[PDB]
Design an enzyme around this catalytic site. Structure first.
Site, PDB file in Angstrom:
ATOM      1  N   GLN A  20      44.852  44.258  38.252  1.00 23.47           N
ATOM      2  CA  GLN A  20      43.569  44.915  38.028  1.00 23.47           C
ATOM      3  C   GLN A  20      43.753  46.316  37.460  1.00 23.47           C
ATOM      4  OE1 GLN A  20      39.965  46.735  40.309  1.00 23.47           O
ATOM      5  NE2 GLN A  20      40.633  44.914  41.435  1.00 23.47           N
ATOM      6  N   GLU A  24      42.706  36.984  39.582  1.00 19.83           N
ATOM      7  CA  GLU A  24      41.319  37.132  39.986  1.00 19.83           C
ATOM      8  C   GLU A  24      40.429  36.910  38.778  1.00 19.83           C
ATOM      9  OE1 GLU A  24      41.038  41.022  41.628  1.00 19.83           O
ATOM     10  OE2 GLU A  24      42.098  40.517  43.483  1.00 19.83           O
ATOM     11  N   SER A  71      50.014  47.689  38.603  1.00 15.81           N
ATOM     12  CA  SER A  71      49.823  48.431  39.841  1.00 15.81           C
ATOM     13  C   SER A  71      50.851  47.951  40.859  1.00 15.81           C
ATOM     14  CB  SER A  71      48.404  48.248  40.373  1.00 15.81           C
ATOM     15  OG  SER A  71      48.248  46.982  40.986  1.00 15.81           O
ATOM     16  N   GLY A 115      49.756  42.881  45.295  1.00 11.57           N
ATOM     17  CA  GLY A 115      50.529  41.659  45.383  1.00 11.57           C
ATOM     18  C   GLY A 115      50.769  40.993  44.045  1.00 11.57           C
ATOM     19  N   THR A 116      49.695  40.518  43.408  1.00 14.70           N
ATOM     20  CA  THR A 116      49.845  39.839  42.126  1.00 14.70           C
ATOM     21  C   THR A 116      50.400  40.775  41.060  1.00 14.70           C
ATOM     22  OG1 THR A 116      48.734  38.453  40.485  1.00 14.70           O
ATOM     23  CG2 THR A 116      47.464  40.275  41.413  1.00 14.70           C
ATOM     24  N   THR A 157      44.821  53.106  49.655  1.00 18.43           N
ATOM     25  CA  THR A 157      43.743  52.173  49.949  1.00 18.43           C
ATOM     26  C   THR A 157      44.174  50.935  50.723  1.00 18.43           C
ATOM     27  OG1 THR A 157      41.899  50.942  48.963  1.00 18.43           O
ATOM     28  CG2 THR A 157      44.010  50.896  47.800  1.00 18.43           C
ATOM     29  N   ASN A 159      48.251  58.410  41.391  1.00 22.25           N
ATOM     30  CA  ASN A 159      46.833  58.727  41.246  1.00 22.25           C
ATOM     31  C   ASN A 159      46.464  60.077  41.849  1.00 22.25           C
ATOM     32  OD1 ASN A 159      46.590  56.223  40.067  1.00 22.25           O
ATOM     33  ND2 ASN A 159      45.664  55.241  41.861  1.00 22.25           N
ATOM     34  N   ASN A 217      42.039  56.587  33.873  1.00 27.55           N
ATOM     35  CA  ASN A 217      42.417  55.668  32.806  1.00 27.55           C
ATOM     36  C   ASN A 217      42.351  56.347  31.447  1.00 27.55           C
ATOM     37  OD1 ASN A 217      42.666  53.573  34.758  1.00 27.55           O
ATOM     38  ND2 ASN A 217      40.454  53.212  34.634  1.00 27.55           N
ATOM     39  N   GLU A 231      64.222  56.081  20.007  1.00 31.54           N
ATOM     40  CA  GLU A 231      64.733  57.446  20.118  1.00 31.54           C
ATOM     41  C   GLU A 231      64.202  58.158  21.354  1.00 31.54           C
ATOM     42  OE1 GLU A 231      66.159  60.218  16.402  1.00 31.54           O
ATOM     43  OE2 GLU A 231      64.053  59.628  16.513  1.00 31.54           O
TER      44      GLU A 231
END
Ligand SMILES: Nc1nc2c(ncn2[C@@H]2O[C@H](COP(=O)(O)OP(=O)(O)OP(=O)(O)O)[C@@H](O)[C@H]2O)c(=O)[nH]1
Ligand SMILES: Nc1nc2c(ncn2[C@@H]2O[C@H](COP(=O)(O)OP(=O)(O)O)[C@@H](O)[C@H]2O)c(=O)[nH]1
Ligand SMILES: [Mg+2]
Lengths: 95, 102, 253, 436, 430
Positions: free
Chosen positions: D11, D68, D137, D141-142, D176, D203, D225, D251
């Site tokens: 995500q 997802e 991220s 997990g994924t 989180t 972050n 972002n 380089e």
């Protein structure tokens, strides 16, 4: 996620995008002919009765089925499938 | 190629190195970030952290840590006797030679 | 099929009747060695047979989940009415009503007088087995409908005091005369107010279970002796690999 | 004729690629429909990121991965529906639920093959493939699992092609999730020997930058972002715009990686100034490079003052002049608060580009004529590794949340070896940092 | 895609499910005729999670209503939104359990449960990708606490890989309308702690206290309690049904809320609840939402959360808000209450954001917390259990239907051991 018209009345042989466009651009899937609200007062406004009844007993007890069935439109597959040019131009898209 | 012999019998065992050292770290576990202004609420810090890159980050009057700040609470004989309060006991500590010069 | 071919029929295909009964299971009490699949399957049915009459000796009858029902009719005579699923397997069996019940009493438990359940608790405790394995074993054997649907395959399932015969599709049963006369002697059993209502808390369950017909089916071994043998054998298990090493000669003697 | 393929997994990777590709489209003038901006009006500069389809529109050289369906379906519904290839936004059916074992052994195996199909289908088209970019991220997990699988498969499938990683480790104290150290250390093991360059994008530091500079007390992921997209654009613009001193993607490894083991490094950007006070200062190259080397502007939560400097790569885009850059570099070298390692007398590689940074409507930055993005390798990075190590040791001592990972096919000894790998990684940095 | 089915049984379960489906229909814009009239596009994208599509364009909940007595379901059918539920899924007996665990779990449950297993199998196989099951019932009732648990065991052993959720109504000793509550409650808990993946306890007396103190309304009724429970229920699946800054499904919650398999009991809460004469004075901001979230009076159970230590917690934020203030407040409240947070796990709070607030609201939060303070209710239930069991009170009813005191002894032993090993981690130190 859930393009509406595909599952209940199965669509015939065509591209997924084409059938999705047809079943989204179609009428219904909205507007209240019955004028109810999801909040829960027009339920007691309305009556909830189906006008497809008659009578029974001592002769025949099967009764005709609901309006969930086409009519007049009984018309063969080769008719829909094979027409010459009377369709929307696939690549017109005025510039 | 391969050559046959008696001495090839009883093959040698595998002897890898026993173990590499578990670790060595010289940074403290809790390093307060330099400009971390996540921490200035109810403190006399004008929206910036220490910003000096100090490992300790000594705290003065306000600080930011309390055990039971917001939902804390779950005898006649016991009471406050003579000078248990902050403003009782009008006495002063003892002297030190001091340095100043540094 | 003399109640033993059914055991062979259940065992020889594992895929058609999967479950924990197909393989041996450890006993609850370490003093008892495990049993092989056929032996433990017979032992369970022995204990259930003993359990059925002991409840049936009282005013309360017992039934199975999907195989018949050991009931009795009071004007005391038992009939072992079958279950609806077992009735479907029978084809030429006449559906003659035995017990007279009205429309109010619809469930087989209601039209009965003292209907029970044949709980897997006492059965597992008596055989020193788990509750789940006994339940799976009953479900494995209760699938005699599949065997019954096939033509022929006569069954005389005994498991104790009842003697039930199964023809091609007919059903007919016989009962022990001594047990029949036992029901018709002292049957205080029906009513509940005979007891002085004081011993429910005075008497512990162990005293009731000690004098019960259960736990006497199998001989109680010496727990210390069997543990001593097993530990001694396990000692010879691991270190008997070598015999050459002596370090104690004793040439002369 | 030079192409870079961007890989977006998870995500966070998807939501940063959204901003990156919006910035690229705006910067090259391509409409969201994928066409030149209407009939109002080519330099063949878009070829680095886009490819001509032979009739009209351009197609980005990107691939999106997730298990997802929500984010990918909503992207498909969005206004960029007609830009991407319909089968380039690969979506799963069930989430990994923040479980590294699930996305590394159970679920990701049925999607990695199709991702490899698509990635080679994109790679065979380009003739001058410069390298790969991967965004993921770590605390997911994924994200971590699929990034690990993709990196492992790409390494064996391609060999000497360079890969650049822009990872987001958990912040020191603010986060989180409650199980993120586990998959964090596991992905660290996976990427240590598989990625060529890693750039740290914590972050908390970006929140600090926004609060201190842009004067925004209500910031969200969009600002972060956008900042990361600006960093990527500044990094890549040398591959597609003319400049007085060019630096290619090949380089960077040859100038910021003293040894193959040590390739973890952090980035910085300047100027980051809100329009209310933006150019009420001169923004000479001297003060923008001073702000870039200012420790409070680190894009990762680390203090360079706590360690030595290995090498620095900084690139100026705008109207800079080499003499001013030399003067600023000399001033920084004479500055005493910043010290370099003894075996690195010269440690600066400078690139100059003449394309001024582009502005996006609804953004927070200001329209500069000068900017600088600096990526430095320093031994001070070990502090985040140490504090991350301490967090894991607390939970692992009591077998906390370990049954969730064991029950998904992962062997028990994975955690111990991952801890040993972190220990060895820390072993490297302090040994090389000491004076001979 | 990752849709869940609904199973409800017993009087309390049916009452909860009626209001839950009313709330779901309202929030997805489903009229009592089953006609979609959503004001947006994405109220229909994920509607298949609970609503099946049939011919004629009407939508239907994939719910199973079941009981041993038809008395409750004929009443719920005649109520509002009663045409949505489908009599083909209605399975009923003719005797009832009479607040007896034995009757609702052994005699009538076993013989009748085959049909409901058949219908559940049919619905699950019809579903494309089954996310899991949810069940609402009560532990003080005979048919509910027995038959729901047996069905839970059966569906669990049939679909071990699927997730499971339950919304359980634990009986309270203060306001107790049944004199046999400890027996069936303990018996149901014994199987529930073994089978259910996730459990969320609901206390009626806590609902009474919340309704009388926060909302400050003079005449509480079961409708308001059902509405609060339904809102809390929908707060969990809001993220699954709608896009957000951080999506999170039920599987993600379990990984972040279950340190060890046996500890799977949660207490929930909803914010903001305000008296109608005061929200003109209150300000709806993130700090207010967090403080009302963590207020002990707001919890859905009688257990005091400040009598123990929070193992972990999860917060589900609804509405267009930035991850900034939510995570700031989480960190601040965790730092300021180190006494009530166990120390060998760092940052034990999970935060997720979704962009759909409840209709008529701007922001809302659903709280799910795992704290060591739930053992108190288990202890008080057990003390009643042993006191009323030592005299062998009312055990003739139970022993006349297949059970003996060995099952009770095994159940009480498991419950006490659970309490011991549940308070064990409270005193644990790093
Ligand atoms: N900087 C930044 N980080 C993000 C953003 N979105 C998600 N993340 C990071 O992602 C982490 C959690 O993972 P998710 O983004 O929810 O999803 P995932 O990484 O694919 O893993 P799953 O949750 O299993 O799907 C958080 O700790 C964030 O740090 C974003 O927009 N910007
Ligand atoms: N929240 C709520 N609780 C209820 C409702 N109806 C009953 N209960 C609770 O359920 C308990 C009785 O359960 P019971 O009706 O015997 O369950 P059953 O045997 O499965 O039908 C009481 O203690 C009530 O507190 C309701 O409408 N809402
Ligand atoms: Mg995710």
């Amino acid at each position: 996620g859930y393009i509406p018209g595909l599952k209940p009345n199965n669509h015939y042989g065509a591209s997924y995008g084409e059938i999705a466009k047809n079943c989204l651009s179609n009428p219904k899937v909205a507007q209240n002919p019955f004028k109810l609200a999801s909040t829960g007062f027009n339920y007691q406004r309305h009556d909830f009765r189906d006008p497809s009844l008659t009578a029974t007993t001592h002769k025949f007890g099967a009764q005709t089925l609901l309006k969930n069935h086409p009519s007049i439109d009984q018309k063969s597959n080769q008719w829909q499938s094979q027409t010459h040019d009377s369709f929307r131009n696939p690549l017109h898209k005025p510039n | 190629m391969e050559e046959e012999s008696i001495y090839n019998l009883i093959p040698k065992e595998y002897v890898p190195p026993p173990k590499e050292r578990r670790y060595r770290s010289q940074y403290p576990n809790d390093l307060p970030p330099t400009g971390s202004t996540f921490i200035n609420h109810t403190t006399s810090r004008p929206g910036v952290a220490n910003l000096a890159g100090d490992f300790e980050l000594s705290k003065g009057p306000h600080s930011h840590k309390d055990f039971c700040s917001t939902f804390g609470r779950v005898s006649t004989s016991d009471f406050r006797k003579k000078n248990t309060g902050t403003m009782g006991s009008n006495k002063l500590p003892i002297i030190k030679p001091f340095k100043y010069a540094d | 099929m003399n109640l033993d071919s059914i055991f062979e029929w259940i065992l020889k295909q594992p895929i058609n009747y999967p479950g924990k009964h197909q393989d041996s299971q450890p006993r609850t009490n370490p003093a008892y060695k495990p049993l092989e699949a056929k032996a433990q399957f017979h032992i369970i049915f022995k204990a259930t047979g003993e359990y059925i009459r002991e409840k049936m000796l009282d005013g309360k009858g017992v039934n199975m989940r999907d195989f018949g029902a050991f009931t009795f009719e009071i004007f005391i005579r038992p009939c072992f009415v079958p279950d609806k699923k077992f009735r479907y397997s029978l084809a030429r069996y006449a559906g003659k009503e035995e017990i007279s019940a009205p429309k109010s009493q619809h469930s087989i438990y209601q039209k009965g007088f003292g209907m029970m359940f044949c709980n897997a608790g006492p059965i597992a405790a008596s055989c020193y087995l788990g509750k789940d394995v006994v339940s799976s074993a009953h479900n494995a054997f209760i699938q005699a409908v599949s065997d019954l649907t096939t033509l022929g395959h006569g069954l005389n399932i005994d498991f104790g005091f009842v003697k039930v015969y199964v023809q091609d599709r007919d059903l007919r049963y016989s009962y022990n005369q001594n047990f029949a006369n036992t029901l018709n002697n002292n049957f205080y059993r029906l009513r509940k107010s005979d007891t002085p209502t004081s011993e429910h808390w005075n008497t512990t369950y162990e005293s009731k279970w000690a004098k019960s017909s259960l736990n006497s089916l199998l001989k109680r071994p010496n727990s210390n002796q069997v543990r001593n043998y097993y530990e001694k054998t396990l000692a010879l298990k691991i270190m008997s690999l070598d015999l050459s090493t002596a370090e104690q000669t004793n040439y002369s003697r | 004729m030079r192409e870079v393929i961007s890989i977006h997994v998870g995500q966070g990777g998807i939501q940063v690629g959204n901003a990156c590709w919006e910035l690229f489209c705006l910067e090259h003038g391509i409409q969201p429909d994928g066409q030149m901006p209407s009939d109002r009006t080519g330099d063949d500069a878009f070829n680095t990121f886009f490819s001509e389809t032979g009739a009209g529109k351009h197609v980005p050289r990107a691939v999106f991965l997730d298990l997802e369906p929500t984010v990918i379906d909503e992207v498909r519904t969005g206004t960029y529906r007609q830009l991407f290839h319909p089968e380039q936004l690969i979506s799963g059916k069930e989430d990994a639920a923040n479980n590294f074992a699930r996305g590394h052994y159970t679920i990701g195996k049925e999607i990695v093959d199709l991702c490899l199909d698509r990635i080679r289908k994109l790679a065979d088209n380009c003739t001058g493939l410069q390298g790969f970019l991967v965004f993921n991220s770590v605390g997911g997990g994924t994200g971590s699992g699929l990034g690990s699988l993709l990196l492992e498969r790409l390494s064996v499938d391609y060999g000497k092609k360079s890969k650049l990683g822009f990872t987001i480790y958990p912040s020191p104290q603010v986060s989180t999730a409650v199980v993120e150290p586990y998959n964090s250390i596991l992905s660290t093991h996976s990427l240590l020997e598989h990625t060529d360059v890693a750039v740290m994008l914590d972050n908390e530091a970006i929140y600090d930058i926004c609060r201190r500079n842009l004067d925004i007390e209500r910031p969200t992921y969009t600002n972060l972002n956008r900042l990361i997209a600006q960093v990527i654009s500044s990094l890549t613009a040398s591959l597609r715009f003319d400049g007085a001193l060019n630096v290619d993607i090949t380089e960077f490894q040859t100038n910021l990686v003293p040894y193959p083991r040590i390739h973890f490094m952090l980035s910085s950007y300047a100027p980051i100034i809100s329009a209310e006070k933006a150019y009420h200062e001169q923004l000479s190259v001297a003060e923008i490079t001073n702000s870039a080397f200012e420790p409070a502007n680190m894009m990762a939560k680390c203090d360079p003052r706590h360690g030595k400097y290995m090498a620095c790569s900084m690139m100026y885009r705008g109207d800079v002049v080499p003499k001013d850059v030399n003067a600023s570099i000399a001033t920084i070298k004479t500055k005493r608060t910043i010290q370099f390692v003894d075996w690195c007398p010269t440690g600066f590689k400078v690139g100059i580009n003449y394309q001024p940074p582009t502005v996006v409507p609804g953004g927070d930055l200001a329209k500069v004529m000068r900017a600088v993005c600096m990526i430095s390798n320093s031994t001070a990075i070990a502090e985040v590794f140490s504090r991350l190590d301490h967090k894991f040791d607390l939970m692992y001592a009591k077998r906390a949340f370990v049954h969730w990972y064991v029950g998904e096919g992962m062997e028990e000894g994975e955690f111990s070896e991952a801890r040993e790998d972190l220990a060895a990684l820390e072993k490297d940095y302090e040994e090389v940092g000491i004076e001979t | 895609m990752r849709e869940i089915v609904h199973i409800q049984g017993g009087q309390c379960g049916n009452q909860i499910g009626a209001k839950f489906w009313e709330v779901i229909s309202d929030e997805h814009g489903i009229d009592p005729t089953g006609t979609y009239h959503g004001d947006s596009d994405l109220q229909l994208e994920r509607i298949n999670v609970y609503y099946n599509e049939a011919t004629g364009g009407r939508y239907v909940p994939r719910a199973i209503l079941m009981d041993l007595e038809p008395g409750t379901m004929d009443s719920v059918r005649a109520g509002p939104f009663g045409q949505l539920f489908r009599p083909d899924n209605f399975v009923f007996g003719q005797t009832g359990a009479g607040n007896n665990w034995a009757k609702g779990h052994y005699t009538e449950g076993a013989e009748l449960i085959d049909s409901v297993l058949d219908v559940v199998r049919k619905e699950a196989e019809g579903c494309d990708c089954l996310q899991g099951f949810q069940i609402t019932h009560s532990l003080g009732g005979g048919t509910g606490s027995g038959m729901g648990t047996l069905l839970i065991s059966k569906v669990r052993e049939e679909y071990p890989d699927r997730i499971m959720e339950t919304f359980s109504v634990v009986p309270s000793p203060k306001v107790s309308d049944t004199v046999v509550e400890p027996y069936n409650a303990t018996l149901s808990v014994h199987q529930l702690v073994e089978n259910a993946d996730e459990c969320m306890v609901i206390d009626n007396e806590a609902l009474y206290d919340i309704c009388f103190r926060t909302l400050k309304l003079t005449t509480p009724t079961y409708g308001d309690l059902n509405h609060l429970v339904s809102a809390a229920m929908s707060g969990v699946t809001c993220c699954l049904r709608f896009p957000g800054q951080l999506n999170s499904d039920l599987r993600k919650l379990a990984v972040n809320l279950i340190p060890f398999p046996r500890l799977h009991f949660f207490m929930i809460g909803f914010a903001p609840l305000t008296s109608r004469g005061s929200q003109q004075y209150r300000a709806l901001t993130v700090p207010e939402l967090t403080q009302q979230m963590f207020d002990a009076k707001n919890m859905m159970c009688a257990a005091d959360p400040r009598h123990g230590r929070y193992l972990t917690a999860s917060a589900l934020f609804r509405g267009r808000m930035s991850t900034k203030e939510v995570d700031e407040q989480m960190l601040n409240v965790q730092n300021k209450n180190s006494s009530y947070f166990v120390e060998w796990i760092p940052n034990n709070i999970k935060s997720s954001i979704c962009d759909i607030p409840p209709k008529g609201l701007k922001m809302a939060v659903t709280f799910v917390g795992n704290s060591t303070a739930i053992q108190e209710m288990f202890k008080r239930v057990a003390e009643q259990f042993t006191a009323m069991f030592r005299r062998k009170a009312f055990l003739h009813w139970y022993t006349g239907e297949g059970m003996d005191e060995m099952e009770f002894t095994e159940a009480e032993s498991n419950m006490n051991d659970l309490v011991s090993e549940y308070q064990q981690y409270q005193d644990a130190t790093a």
